[PDB]
């Protein structure tokens, strides 16, 4: 298990195009994770954390992205909101664990870091673990709008403008979702 990149990366991934690393045959030590005390949120759902270093699965997936501080409560099975509706949806019988830690000093820069976007309009909520990187314009009230903003119609992506002088709950948090699967 090479958690190197997967965790200590220099640049994370957006929230609307999360990453997806497929950890594979290895020796995984979830204790170095569980006790690192550097994580602000470590919830385990299918399985309590201390019994991870005593079980075996078929695949572990690790998804990575960056969100606001108070949006970490939508990364959980059965939630709603701009993030869980159409950015990243967790199935209703999730099995893995969700880890999250504050990263204000790395991702927020004076003048605003406008490189971290999220999707705020979609036709229909995502299926669990579904991903959507398109950019086709939206569609307000009945009308054409052949590629062009205007009355009732506009781009679908917004950007967190992160600043270092932002109250907590507005500072960037990095999130990693481990999902153990057993085919």
């Amino acid at each position: 298990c090479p958690f190197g990149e997967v965790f200590n990366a220099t640049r994370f991934a957006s929230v609307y195009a999360w990453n997806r690393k497929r950890i594979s045959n290895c020796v995984a030590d979830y204790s170095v994770l569980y006790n690192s005390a550097s994580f602000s949120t470590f919830k385990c759902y299918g399985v309590s954390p201390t019994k991870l270093n005593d079980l075996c699965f078929t695949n572990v997936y690790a998804d990575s992205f960056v969100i606001r501080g108070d949006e970490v409560r939508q990364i959980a099975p059965g939630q709603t909101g701009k993030i869980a509706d159409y950015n990243y949806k967790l199935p209703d019988d999730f099995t893995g664990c969700v880890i999250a830690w504050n990263s204000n000093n790395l991702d927020s820069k004076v003048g605003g870091n406008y490189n971290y976007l999220y999707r705020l309009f979609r036709k229909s909520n995502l299926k669990p673990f579904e991903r959507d990187i398109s950019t086709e314009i939206y569609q307000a009230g009945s009308t054409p709008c052949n590629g062009v903003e205007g009355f009732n119609c506009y781009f679908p992506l917004q950007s967190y403008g992160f600043q270092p002088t932002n109250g907590v709950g507005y500072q960037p948090y990095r999130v990693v979702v481990l999902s153990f699967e057993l085919l």
Partner: protein, 39 residues
């Protein structure tokens, strides 16, 4: 229709909060350290 107004305000509530921030952050730097390159 009414659902068109809800989608109008969400676009507003995201663009306003950032533009009101900077416009009030620059008013802080003038108020606590006066130059004319801050006015």
């Amino acid at each position: 229709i009414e659902e068109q107004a809800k989608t109008f305000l969400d676009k507003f509530n995201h663009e306003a909060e950032d533009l009101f921030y900077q416009s009030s952050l620059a008013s802080w730097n003038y108020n606590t350290n006066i130059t004319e390159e801050n006015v």
